[PDB]
Design a protein around this ligand. Structure first.
Ligand SMILES: CC(=O)N1CCc2c(c(-c3ccc(C(F)(F)F)c(SCC(=O)N4CCCC4)c3)nn2C[C@H](O)CN2CCC(C(C)(C)O)CC2)C1
Length: 221
């Protein structure tokens, strides 16, 4: 059996909530967020990775469009191909498209591989979050209720399983039997519960949270 509840923040594996601003870079924050946790597990150091590095450098070859959107999976592939990603401190976020300024001097992580989970499987998603770490996912965030969410287990009747906003599942649990995913957003600390949103779990792939999950790994060799 899996634990009833997990919260990778309690294991020191989750950096501060970031603020994407007017740049549609949530895919980039989702990607680095998943990698930050694998890095902490392997090295003992928690260090924000450079979302801007991805925006500026993980571009056309990876099907990504900088501030106009992208994919976590090909973000990971870029880090594999590039043999590194800079720290956020060395390559901080500017919420706009820029020229690629990747520098191997300031590499703070690598990526060995990534794994994609099957569409809609919230049981498989739960197992990965428990056994692997935070999982990059897309959600359907095209709803005023999403922007307006303040607290509780978010359930939107009109939500769809088509995803358009990258976020990071850092855990799961229940509140009085209402099951939820613990989701790290990139809209700063003032959104939701200190930048997090708890989203309805085991409710028919609500908002497409398990439509396109994936997580990276950093192996010993
Ligand atoms: C039915 C649905 O929901 N989908 C359709 C399929 C889909 C979907 C997302 C998905 C997941 C997470 C998010 C996120 F960011 F929200 F988390 C988003 S948002 C994306 C977005 O806004 N974009 C994209 C460019 C600019 C605007 C989409 N992945 N896949 C699968 C990819 O096709 C796999 N792979 C194919 C080869 C690759 C290559 C080699 C051709 O480059 C390109 C990719 C959205």
């Amino acid at each position: 059996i899996l634990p009833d509840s997990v919260d990778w923040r309690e294991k020191g594996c989750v950096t501060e909530v970031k603020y994407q601003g007017s740049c549609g870079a949530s895919w980039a924050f989702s990607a680095v967020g998943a990698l930050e946790a694998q890095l902490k597990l392997k090295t003992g150091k928690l260090v924000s990775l450079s979302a801007q590095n991805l925006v500026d450098c993980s571009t056309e070859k990876y099907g990504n469009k900088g501030c106009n959107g992208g994919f976590m999976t090909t973000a990971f592939q870029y880090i594999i191909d590039n043999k590194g990603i800079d720290s956020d401190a060395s390559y901080p976020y500017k919420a706009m498209d820029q020229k690629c300024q990747y520098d191997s001097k300031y590499r703070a992580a690598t990526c060995s591989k990534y794994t994609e989970l099957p569409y809609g499987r919230e049981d498989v998603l739960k197992e990965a979050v428990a056994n692997k770490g935070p999982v990059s996912v897309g959600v359907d965030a095209r709803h005023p209720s999403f922007f307006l969410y303040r607290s509780g287990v978010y359930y939107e009747p009109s939500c769809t399983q088509n995803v358009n906003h990258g976020v990071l599942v850092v855990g799961y649990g229940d509140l009085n039997g209402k099951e939820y995913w613990l989701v790290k957003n990139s809209w700063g600390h003032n959104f939701g519960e200190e930048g997090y949103i708890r989203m309805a779990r085991n409710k028919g792939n609500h908002c497409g949270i398990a439509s396109f999950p994936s997580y990276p790994e950093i192996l010993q060799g």
